[PDB]
């Protein structure tokens, strides 16, 4: 009977940077995706392993809404299999993924005239991530601040006069768990 909160994970006042991406575990409440359906705001609504026709006619054990904010040009790396910076060094999704990536465009919120140097992303790293991992180690990566030893993070610059490939697209990645066990969240 309980309607869960996609309201403290979707219309949030500030989303976490890519390299440190939030996550909420929702369970034990009926999941009404009818507030996600009827809206022309969301750019992307791409359900993997499930079809968005049936999301309201299924029962799961957990859902994992991972909020963050990436660059508009890089919202296609949030998908099983891709490559780049957001996929290798920041946030990698598993191949056998079953969820619904949802990445609308917030350019009025995450942008300033001179720049919005808050949202960051990890640019350098030894190996690529493992599915659903995160690391917050901001020590100076090496290939003192100087030659051949430069900090690993570099912030995003978000002015409103950027185009589209350089604007803030608040991504959200619902992740459903299909496990043979008592079903917790239903439709």
């Amino acid at each position, epitope marked *: 009977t309980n309607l869960c909160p996609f309201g403290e994970v979707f219309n949030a006042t500030r989303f976490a940077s890519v390299y440190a991406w939030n*996550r909420k575990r929702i369970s034990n409440c009926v999941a009404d995706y009818s507030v996600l359906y009827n809206s022309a705001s969301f750019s992307t609504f791409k359900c993997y392993g499930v079809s968005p026709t049936k999301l309201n006619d299924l029962c799961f054990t957990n859902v994992y809404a991972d909020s963050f904010v990436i660059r508009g040009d890089e919202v296609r790396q949030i998908a099983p299999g891709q490559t780049g910076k957001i996929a290798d060094y920041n946030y990698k999704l*598993p191949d056998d993924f079953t969820g619904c990536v949802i990445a609308w465009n917030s350019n009025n919120l995450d942008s300033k005239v001179g720049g919005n140097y808050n949202y960051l992303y990890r640019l350098f790293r030894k190996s690529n991530l493992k599915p*659903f991992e995160r690391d917050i180690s901001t020590e100076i990566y090496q290939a003192v601040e100087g030659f051949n030893c430069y900090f690993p993070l570099q912030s995003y610059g978000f002015q409103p006069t950027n185009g589209v490939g350089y604007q803030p697209y608040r991504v959200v990645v619902l992740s459903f768990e299909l496990l043979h066990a008592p079903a917790t969240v239903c439709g």
Partner: antibody
Amino acid sequence: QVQLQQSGAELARPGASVKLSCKASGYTFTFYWMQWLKQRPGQGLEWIGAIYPGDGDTRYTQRFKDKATLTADKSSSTAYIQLSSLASEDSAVYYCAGGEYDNYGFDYWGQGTTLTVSS
Amino acid sequence: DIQMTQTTSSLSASLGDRVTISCRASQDISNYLNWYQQKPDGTVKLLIYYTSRLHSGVPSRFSGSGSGTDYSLTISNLEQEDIATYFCQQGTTLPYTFGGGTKLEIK
């Protein structure tokens, strides 16, 4: 390097209660499951249960439902099991294991705390 | 409660041989079977997570395979380095049910 640091050897008296500890550090503990196991000497492991340190809801097996209890401390990044209603059958090399993706196995594991029940 | 029966609980081999370890499940776990290694000290680590060879940071020797219910790990070149009890597990149903473990040993 993520290690799940686990307590040393501990021995108990039949009828008391023990609280083992598995101080996970190096990764975001509050985000993924913590799965407690129990390896009796000479057999395979036996899943005791799991706990999600984020909001603290547990997945208990059926055999170990009444004796064992799982808790977690978000501030110090540690997870607890409390073995109550002891006996000689509660001697084993207990373990703690967890990973970020639970369909891809158990990435990180503890060394093990041996609980011995004698007099 | 799928029941994983690693029917063999001890294997005999020598240096350099290609030795495989098996594991058999009652139901069909739909390719959700892992393969750990538990050295005598207790330091247990994962070798391959997704049944068909998807390994996790381990040497390039450990590569298993299989499909349906019956899977099988495989070591191609052996050494005293890899002497432990190799466990199998199913990830499809609660509660997880590990295997018996095949303790390797030199002949």
